[PDB]
Design a protein around this ligand. Structure first.
Ligand SMILES: [Mg+2]
Ligand SMILES: [Mg+2]
Ligand SMILES: [Mg+2]
Ligand SMILES: [Mg+2]
Ligand SMILES: [Mg+2]
Ligand SMILES: [Mg+2]
Ligand SMILES: [Mg+2]
Ligand SMILES: [Mg+2]
Ligand SMILES: [Mg+2]
Ligand SMILES: [Mg+2]
Ligand SMILES: [Mg+2]
Ligand SMILES: [Mg+2]
Ligand SMILES: [Mg+2]
Ligand SMILES: [Mg+2]
Ligand SMILES: [Mg+2]
Ligand SMILES: [Mg+2]
Ligand SMILES: [Mg+2]
Ligand SMILES: [Mg+2]
Ligand SMILES: [Mg+2]
Ligand SMILES: [Mg+2]
Ligand SMILES: [Zn+2]
Lengths: 120, 125, 31, 136, 50, 86, 51, 50
RNA sequence: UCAGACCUCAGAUCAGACGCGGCGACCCGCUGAAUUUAAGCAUAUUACUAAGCGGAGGAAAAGAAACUAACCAGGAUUCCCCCAGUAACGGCGAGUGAAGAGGGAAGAGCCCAGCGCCGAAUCCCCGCCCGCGGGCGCGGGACGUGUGGCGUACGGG
RNA sequence: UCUAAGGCUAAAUACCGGCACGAGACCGAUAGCGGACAAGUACCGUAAGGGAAAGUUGAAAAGAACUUUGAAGAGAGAGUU
RNA sequence: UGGUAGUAGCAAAUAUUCAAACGAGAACUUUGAAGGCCGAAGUGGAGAAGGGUUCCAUGUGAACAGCAGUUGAACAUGGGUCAGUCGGUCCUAAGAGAUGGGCGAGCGCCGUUCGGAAGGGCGGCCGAUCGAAAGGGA
RNA sequence: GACUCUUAGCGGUGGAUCACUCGGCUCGUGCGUCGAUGAAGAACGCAGCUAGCUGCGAGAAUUAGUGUGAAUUGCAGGACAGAUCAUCGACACUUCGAACGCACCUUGCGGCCCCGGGCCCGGGGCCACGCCUGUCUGAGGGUCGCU
């Protein structure tokens, strides 16, 4: 069981494999309390991580399609917006911090610091 | 001497970083020198120890010329187990004696796709 | 399990302080 | 009015220097208190300025000018982007507005030797710091 | 008391499960220094209070 | 009397567990925790007790999210991208 | 009780008369699920590995 | 070329130890507040105290 | 006004944003003691300190003169050295106590309102359309109870 | 001599908290942080708070098989080093 | 860590005895018998607050149970609390406490009607909410 | 000679002393980053055998990705042939807490929308307060107009 082999599977085939792992883990939980054997107790952790692998591919696939659907839209869900830092998300945009008033645009064009050298 | 300000010479820092080193770092620390025939063949002085490698003990009580294959690499204890380096307990059952990798010399290397890639990089420089 | 004595009384021992803080008129006459 | 000392029954337990309760004056002006209350109630806005509009025997009326620093009409104008910065959070609570800065004693000249080096506590801390050099 | 709240009963559940002795296969590990469970609590000597 | 006989008349809990700080300092009649100041919006902390401050400050607990921001800061808070595949 | 009753009807495809639920001292909830009179609790116990 | 070394400022003073006064057959040294701890009743401030 | 506009003031789980708490070493605004010293003690001192409250940032604050000076003049602020335990303050008792100049670290200066010229020349929002920005609307607003451009004491047009 | 009652502005500066490092004429388990350890832990108090003790087998568990006395602890041999 | 010192002490509420069993081991356990006590404002049978697994079964006899113990509220391993109609949940009691408003440098405080307060089906209510396991309550 | 006294050997009690040090303290340097996109702290739960510590969140002693390249290890096991570890840009992240439907000494009491099953049950998404802009619905001879 590998996550790279689950990328091509459809969502219906992943859900079919998901419940097959859930009915298997439940039977291992029954074998744990009924004495069972060490061969089945060691399989509990194996099936637990197989459910985690299938569920991760399902969640990562739908999350990718949601970002593709809201790609380039003005209002995105809060789980699709970037989570950098509450302080960073409240800064001016790259375009806003680069805006200069028309009065400063003339002072920067005309009276910018020239490149020069002094002999002594 | 050591001139890099990024490297430490403190005895406590170097001892803490050694006993608490991760598993992939203990592999590099638990290296062993290659034999004269291997150091000249691959132009590599030392290689990290491997399970199926055959070694010769050069120091201690079990030192000699008998080539023995490693049976276990216990990185948590900084020690390896060799196929013939062992002793008998009180109840007759045999138990392997731990030998440090820096105390054995590699006479034969378990060469796979990854082992040959490291021998090529270590010899390239 | 060959430590039965101390493992059984570890729940019954209580620490105590080092020093426990605990809580005549005498005037004769004829002056 | 002034500031009555909020002590129980007017009993300031201590030396007669601090026995004053009635004739005590607050360090900040009443206009500064108006911006502090206008800015505290509107946490999503930043106080810009304030001015006097009316008086009475018991009331002083002020109008505080607040700004929504997250409105695009404020963030896209470079002349007002300075107040959208995070360093101007609640200027009225730190005495950075026009009315709150007056009570700090700032200024140039011999009148304001007490606030040389930023604030008064910055000046006092520098004036009372024992500089011990290495080769002293 | 018999009249318990869910939070108190759930609190007594956690303190009851922590009152176990240390398993003896812990003492056979490499860097083991624990001889016995030193956080054992008896119902009559140390009261929870909570 | 004031001594041993009085200690037998103690069967009414004054404080209970707090929903904010988890301590047993929530006064039942006051409906106010004497440890964290619950249900006030701000936590009860005072500079006249340095030992009490370092028992419930940032770092004394788990930091389920600050230990991640410390790791994300070493990379510049990168999101929306993935490492180069094999 | 409605969740426990509907769960065992999907995991085992049986019928439930009533569900008695208690919370054990160790923190786990124990459910006493009585089956319909037409079902056999011994037959279901052996089908899932109890007995 | 030598670096400064100094003992922490809070060493031996981060404790609320009050002297029991006289009349307790003790040595008039600030002792730790009472409790169920072996620290309770021990000198905490003087240089002669552990 | 095809009879409604405006002003003022409400409601909403309206559309879209923001505020709250933590930390608080350093920093800003308030508040505020007494031990202690004066061999007592009351002003003074402790101290414009601790504790208390509010507000931030990686720095903060301050900052481009309603300044210093009295010179042959200096030229924003901050910090270091010096001025100096000096001028001065003080039951002129105990004690407290700077600044100009001078030498360095670092150096960067600027923007409005008002005034009067320019057909509000200005801005937000929604939708659509392009590669978080752009055009488009015979779309909805804000705004003349004043937006934008020029322009700020070194003058300016 | 400046032009108050409007605003903005980096650098030199501060940093006992935090994160990551380098170092020591420092301390060396009654010392140095309370805390070299399951330490703000055990424990105490209704509470605010108070708050410890406790590091070292060997190079390698090779941690003493087996025999024997005793119900057993605990011994005698034997054995490891 | 000593002398003290194998000392003080193991003395409130009448009282035990015989036989047997288990067991290395019995004044203390268990069964039987006898003799007694509590004498229904109990040394009886059930709850509340509080305790929190102390409940039950089996096993151990090392530490603890101030003698002993084959026994235990000790230790070790498992088990045990099943509700429409018992209580919580619902109601407000003294109270407590938001909103408007007022105050306050400020965290906040005062305040329980006092403001365009009806989100229902023509509307009156006047005060959100919390507050009883002994009150009310199918 | 019992007892007693001194000295020494040995054996006990006890832990000093010495040696050891993954710790502390101090100094210096570079960064200097929290939160309604749910913080700090707290609760509870999670491992085949797991109490504490530690790490995690019902995908629970970790998933994916990437680097590394044969271990982990107390024991069992075959899960395991990309083992293991590190890193961490993907995903996930229970309850309480600024904590946000109303309340909380209660796993109490609701409302709205949608879906599935038989009004009931289950699931999903929502309903704190303050405030900014806009929208919508309004209010009052408050100022005018039209009647
Ligand atoms: Mg202009
Ligand atoms: Mg400024
Ligand atoms: Mg008791
Ligand atoms: Mg102190
Ligand atoms: Mg705050
Ligand atoms: Mg005096
Ligand atoms: Mg005197
Ligand atoms: Mg203070
Ligand atoms: Mg800087
Ligand atoms: Mg600034
Ligand atoms: Mg003074
Ligand atoms: Mg620092
Ligand atoms: Mg110590
Ligand atoms: Mg019993
Ligand atoms: Mg029993
Ligand atoms: Mg006894
Ligand atoms: Mg027990
Ligand atoms: Mg009620
Ligand atoms: Mg009743
Ligand atoms: Mg001796
Ligand atoms: Zn609390």
């Amino acid at each position: 069981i590998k996550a790279r082999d689950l990328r091509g599977k459809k969502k219906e085939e992943l859900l079919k494999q998901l419940d097959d792992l859930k009915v298997e883990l439940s039977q291992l939980r029954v074998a744990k309390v009924t004495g069972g054997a060490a061969s089945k107790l060691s399989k509990i952790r194996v099936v637990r991580k197989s459910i985690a692998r299938v569920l991760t591919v399902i969640n990562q696939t739908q999350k990718e399609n949601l970002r593709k659907f809201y790609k380039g839209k003005k209002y995105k869900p809060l789980d699709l917006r970037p989570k950098k830092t509450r302080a960073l998300r409240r800064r001016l945009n790259k375009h806003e911090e680069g805006l200069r008033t028309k009065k400063q645009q003339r002072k920067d064009r005309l009276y910018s610091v020239r490149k020069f050298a002094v002999k002594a | 001497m050591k001139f890099s300000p990024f490297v430490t010479s403190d005895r406590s820092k170097n001892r803490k970083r050694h006993f608490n080193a991760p598993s992939h770092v203990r592999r590099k620390i638990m290296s062993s020198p290659l034999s004269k025939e291997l150091r000249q063949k691959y132009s590599v002085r030392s290689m990290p120890i491997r399970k199926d490698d055959e070694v010769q003990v050069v120091r201690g009580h079990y030192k000699g010329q008998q080539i023995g294959k490693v049976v276990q690499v216990y990185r948590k204890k900084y020690v390896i187990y060799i196929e013939r380096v062992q002793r008998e307990k009180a109840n007759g059952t045999t138990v392997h004696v731990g030998i440090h990798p820096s105390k054995v010399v590699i006479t034969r290397l378990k060469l796979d796709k990854d082992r040959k890639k490291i021998l090529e990089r270590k010899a390239k420089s | 399990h060959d430590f039965p004595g101390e493992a059984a009384q570890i729940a019954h021992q209580k620490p105590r302080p080092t020093v426990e803080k605990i809580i005549l008129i005498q005037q004769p006459r004829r002056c | 009015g002034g500031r009555k000392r909020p002590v129980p029954k007017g009993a300031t337990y201590g030396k007669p220097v601090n026995h004053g309760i009635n004739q005590l004056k607050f360090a900040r002006s009443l206009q500064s208190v108006a911006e502090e209350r206008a800015g505290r109630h509107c946490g999503g806005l930043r106080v810009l300025a304030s001015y006097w509009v009316g008086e009475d025997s018991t009331y002083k009326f002020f109008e505080v000018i607040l700004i929504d620093t997250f409105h695009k009409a404020i963030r896209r104008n470079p002349d007002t982007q300075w107040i959208t910065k995070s360093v101007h959070k609640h200027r009225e609570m730190r005495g950075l507005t026009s009315a709150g800065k007056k009570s700090r004693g700032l200024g140039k000249g011999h009148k304001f030797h007490i606030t040389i080096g930023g604030s008064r506590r910055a000046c006092w801390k520098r004036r009372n710091t024992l500089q011990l050099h290495r080769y002293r | 008391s018999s009249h318990k709240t869910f939070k108190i009963k759930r609190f007594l559940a956690k303190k009851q499960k922590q009152n176990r002795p240390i398993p003896q296969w812990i003492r056979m590990k490499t860097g083991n220094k624990i001889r016995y469970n030193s956080k054992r609590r008896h119902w009559r000597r140390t009261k929870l209070g909570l | 009397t004031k001594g041993t006989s009085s200690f037998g008349k103690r069967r009414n809990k004054t404080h209970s567990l707090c929903r904010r700080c988890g301590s047993k300092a929530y006064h039942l009649q006051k409906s106010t925790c004497g440890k964290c100041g619950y249900p006030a919006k701000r936590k009860r902390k005072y500079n006249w007790s340095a030992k009490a401050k370092r028992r419930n400050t940032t770092g004394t607990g788990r930091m389920r999210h600050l230990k991640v921001v410390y790791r994300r800061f070493k990379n510049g808070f990168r999101e929306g991208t993935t490492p180069k595949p094999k | 009780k409605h969740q426990i009753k509907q769960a065992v009807k999907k995991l085992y495809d049986i019928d439930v008369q009533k569900v008695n639920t208690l919370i054990r001292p160790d923190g786990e909830k124990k459910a006493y699920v009585r089956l319909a009179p037409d079902y056999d609790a011994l037959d279901v116990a052996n089908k899932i590995g109890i007995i | 070329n030598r670096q400064p070394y100094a003992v922490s400022k809070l060493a031996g003073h981060q404790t609320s130890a009050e002297s029991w006064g006289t009349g307790r057959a003790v040595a008039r040294i600030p002792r730790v507040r009472g409790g169920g701890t072996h620290r309770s009743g021990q000198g905490a401030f003087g240089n002669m105290c552990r």
